[PDB]
Each structure stands twice: as C-alpha cells, then as structure tokens.
Design a protein around this ligand. Structure first.
Ligand SMILES: *[C@H](C)[C@H]1/C(=C/c2[nH]c(/C=C3N=C(/C=C4\NC(=O)C(CC)=C4C)C(C)=C\3CCC(=O)O)c(CCC(=O)O)c2C)NC(=O)[C@@H]1C
Ligand SMILES: *[C@H](C)[C@H]1/C(=C/c2[nH]c(/C=C3N=C(/C=C4\NC(=O)C(CC)=C4C)C(C)=C\3CCC(=O)O)c(CCC(=O)O)c2C)NC(=O)[C@@H]1C
Ligand SMILES: *[C@H](C)[C@H]1/C(=C/c2[nH]c(/C=C3N=C(/C=C4\NC(=O)C(CC)=C4C)C(C)=C\3CCC(=O)O)c(CCC(=O)O)c2C)NC(=O)[C@@H]1C
Lengths: 273, 117
C-alpha cells in the first residue's frame, strides 16, 4: 500500500513490513473461534527503525510470517514513467543501410533484447554484427541469434525459473507482457520436448511478432498501449515487468531472478487448462 | 434475601462498563463508523476528560481514515501527544502516571508492585 510519510516525527527511517496475519495477531471481538478479517490476510505496517526488531519478533512468535520488508522511501515512489515506452520510437534497417544506420539498429537491438542490462565489449558478438551490413541476415534473424546466444541464456534462462524466463522472453521479443496462465503453460511444454531453441524460435515465428516489426524492424514495446486480444490486466502486469528507465533484468543483483508477475495475477486474466 | 441479577453491578455503578462493548474498525468503513471509533478512543485513551475543538488531533485521525495507520497505531499517536503529556504525565508522579497508563491502555489496574517498578 501507499505510505504517506517517509520518516517519523523523531528522525527515523520508516520500513513497510508485510506479514501473513494470524488469528492470534488480530481477531474479531466476537463469540466463537477467533478469525482475522479475511481482507487482511496480508497485513502491512510501517514501523520506525527502532521498533522494527520488536515488531518482527512478535509477529514471528505468533504464527505470523514475514512476506517482505521494504524501506518506505523506495515504497511510496511514483509508478515508473511510461514516457519513453508510451511511444517506443522504432528502428527500421533499410536495405543499403550506410555504416551509421546499421550501428544504431545494433545498439537498439541489444537494448531491447537484453533489457537495460549492459553488454561488455567481450560479450558483444562480432560475427552476428558482421552478417548484418553485408546483407544476409534480417534484423529478425539477428534477434534470433541473440536469444540463441549464451549471453542471453546465462542472464535470463540459466539463473531464473522457466516460469520467469517465459515472461522475461515475452517482454524482450514482444513489447507485450504475458496474458493468461495458458501462454505460460504452452511455452513450458514446448521447452520440455523441443528444447530451448524451439521455444526461442516460437516467439520470433509467432504472427504477433510478424504483424508488428515483422522483418527488419527492431522490436519495440507494444505493451503500455492498447493491443488487440490483450487482457486489461496485462497492461498492469507491464508496469510490474518494466520498472523505470535504468531498471534492468539482472541476474547480478541479490536473488537476481525472481518473478515480477505473481502466478495468481496471471490466473485472474484467464483460467481453464 | 433476593437480588436481581445485575444487582451487584448496579451497586458500584459498574453497570455500564462491567461487560464492556468493544468498538472495532471494519474494512471499507463508512464516514460515520470511523467517527464513532474516534469518539470511543478519545473517551477511553484520553481520560474521560473533555476534549475541546482545539484539543483534537487532526493529523492522526486523518491517517486513521484511508487506513494509513491502524487503530492500534492511532492509539499510540494519541498517547504521545502534547495533550496526553499535558494531562497525565507532566503533572503526575511516575506512580500516578504508570497507574493511569494501565487503565487507559488496558482496562485492568496494575496487579503488583513489580509491574510498577
Ligand atoms: C467449511 C465449509 C470449509 C472450510 C472452512 C475453513 N475455514 C478455515 C479457516 C478460515 N476461514 C476463514 C473465514 C473467514 N474469516 C472471516 O472473518 C470470515 C467472515 C468475515 C470468514 C468467512 C478464515 C479467515 C480462516 C483462517 C483464520 C481463522 O481461523 O479465522 C478453515 C481452517 C483452515 C486452517 O488451516 O486454519 C477451514 C476448514 N474448509 C473446509 O474444509 C470446508 C470446505
Ligand atoms: C559507481 C559510481 C558505483 C557502482 C556502480 C555499479 N553499477 C552496477 C550495475 C548497474 N548499474 C546500472 C546503472 C544504470 N542503468 C541505467 O540504465 C542507468 C541510467 C540509464 C544507470 C546509471 C545498471 C543498469 C546496472 C545493472 C546491470 C549490470 O550490472 O550489468 C554495478 C555492477 C553490479 C554487480 O554486482 O555486478 C556497479 C558496481 N558501484 C560501485 O562500487 C560504485 C559506488
Ligand atoms: C455549568 C452549568 C456549571 C459548571 C460545570 C462545570 N463542569 C466542569 C467540568 C467537568 N464537568 C464534568 C462533568 C461530567 N462528565 C461527564 O461525563 C458528565 C455526564 C456523565 C458530567 C456532568 C467533568 C468530567 C468535568 C471535567 C472536564 C475535563 O476533564 O476537562 C467545569 C469546568 C471546570 C474545569 O476547570 O474544567 C464546569 C464549570 N460549573 C459552573 O460553574 C456551572 C454552574
């Protein structure tokens, strides 16, 4: 939830704490077995740093358990600005592209395909770049090569879960976020029989890819603007998948690869399987 | 010699408070419902003393609306108030203060000299 003050009247960094409530922790003043209000299954409190230790011990000594702690300053921050992704920009690689134009595409591709994540000089792929700019490879095909590359696998696919990798994939290859639990299930099954290459192939091959930026257009962010057959919630999920500019998909950070989109949220948009 | 049930209560005038009604803030609380918790809290937490317009604490009860703070946190804000200090603590001795805090914070009185210490 929103927190209204970053700091207590006495100086003290507030910290939002989220717990699963337990009947002992709060109960109705009613006859019969004590029940916590259902709406507050996940309770949140903002506590000053001083009372944080005591607060957390008490929660845990009852049947409570801590879902997560977060500094109030990071919380109660604006939802990321969509300014740059509201209109993506878009890059076209003409035939007979001069030297600079090819460079721009390359850069743009690395940006979108890898997230903000930085690609070092050694990481960068000369061979693939070589092919582009003497013809022979489509922008589309380059994009396939990047997702095949180990660089991609090491960041996105080898650290996190396949559940996470799918949506990670969706965002990079298609601006969209994933809609529905089915998409996640389909990709997982594809991966088990066909393997990693076939799964990567299935996003570029998909008509949604073809319909937008089909060939010789660097992929851009379709999500954040209204798309055909897109669940309304997907738009919200795009805010979870995409956090600000200068926010990346990073194996590097503590517990780097986690799920931006909770499984339950996916279930809301659609169920059936 | 017969006593009505609740004769013991009517003597001692504990009739009103003996079993005591609890007030609970509920989800999607109405504007009148919150007003009633505030009314209650100021009666218990403050002493049954009179809170004049000036006395009321605007910022704390604004947070109580829109569920920024819970009632337990509301009570804590009330207890740390010029107003709570001015009455209670600043004029009292620590024995009278601690004995008052028991009561307003929890209905009981202090069970033993240790608790005071
Ligand atoms: C009975 C038909 C089915 C069933 C019920 C069941 N419920 C729990 C535990 C809880 N149920 C609730 C429900 C409410 N709390 C509320 O305040 C309200 C109304 C405002 C409801 C309807 C809650 C919150 C709990 C969890 C905490 C609590 O005990 O109050 C259980 C036990 C779960 C446990 O492991 O503790 C059960 C069994 N489940 C069945 O088996 C039936 C199908
Ligand atoms: C240097 C002053 C301090 C420092 C920096 C540091 N940063 C990273 C990693 C990243 N930092 C960023 C930064 C940005 N992303 C953006 O897009 C922008 C604006 C557009 C910025 C400024 C990002 C994206 C990353 C994550 C990607 C990556 O790490 O490849 C690190 C590396 C973290 C690691 O553990 O590998 C470091 C070291 N850290 C210091 O020691 C200085 C105090
Ligand atoms: C007015 C006709 C006369 C008057 C009254 C008077 N009362 C006070 C102060 C208090 N009066 C009460 C009384 C009650 N509390 C209750 O809940 C009830 C009904 C159940 C009553 C009647 C209380 C508790 C106080 C204290 C208020 C507080 O806690 O601040 C005063 C003011 C005295 C003071 O200095 O506060 C006065 C003047 N006195 C007159 O002169 C009139 C004839």
């Amino acid at each position: 939830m929103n927190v209204l003050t970053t700091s207590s009247q006495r100086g003290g960094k507030l910290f939002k704490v989220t717990m699963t409530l337990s009947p002992a922790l709060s109960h109705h003043p009613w006859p019969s077995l004590d029940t916590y209000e259902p709406s507050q299954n996940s309770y949140s409190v903002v506590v000053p740093l001083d009372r944080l230790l005591a607060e957390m011990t008490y929660i845990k000594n009852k049947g409570g358990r801590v879902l997560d702690i977060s500094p109030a300053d990071l919380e109660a921050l604006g939802p990321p600005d969509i300014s740059s992704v509201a209109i993506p920009l878009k890059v076209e690689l003409w035939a007979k592209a001069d030297v600079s134009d090819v460079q721009a595409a390359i850069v743009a591709a690395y940006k979108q395909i890898f997230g903000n994540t930085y690609v070092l000089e050694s990481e960068r792929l000369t061979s693939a770049e070589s092919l582009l700019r003497n013809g022979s490879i489509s922008v589309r095909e380059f994009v396939r090569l990047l997702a095949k590359s180990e660089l991609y696998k090491e960041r996105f696919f080898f650290c996190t879960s396949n559940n996470r990798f799918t949506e990670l994939n969706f965002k990079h290859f298609l601006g969209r976020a994933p809609y529905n639990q089915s998409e996640i299930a389909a990709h997982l099954d594809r991966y088990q029989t066909f393997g990693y290459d076939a799964e990567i192939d299935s996003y570029i091959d998909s008509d949604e890819y073809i319909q937008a930026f089909g060939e010789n257009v660097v992929p851009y962010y379709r999500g954040f603007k209204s798309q055909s057959g897109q669940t309304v919630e997907s738009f919200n999920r795009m805010f979870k998948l995409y956090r600000g500019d200068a926010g990346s998909d990073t194996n590097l950070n503590l517990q780097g690869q986690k799920r931006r989109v909770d499984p339950k949220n996916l279930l809301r948009s659609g169920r059936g399987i | 010699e017969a006593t009505p049930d609740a004769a013991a209560q009517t003597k001692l005038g504990i009739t009103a408070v003996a079993p005591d009604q609890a007030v609970e803030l509920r989800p999607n609380f109405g504007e009148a419902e919150v007003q009633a918790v505030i009314r209650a809290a100021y009666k218990q937490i403050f002493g049954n003393t009179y809170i004049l317009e000036a006395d009321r604490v605007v910022i704390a009860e604004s947070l109580l609306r829109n569920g920024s703070i819970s009632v337990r946190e509301f009570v804590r804000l009330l207890a740390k108030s010029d107003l709570y200090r001015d009455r209670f603590f600043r004029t009292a001795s620590n024995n009278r203060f601690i004995e008052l805090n028991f009561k307003h914070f929890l209905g009981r009185a202090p069970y033993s000299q240790a608790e005071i210490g």
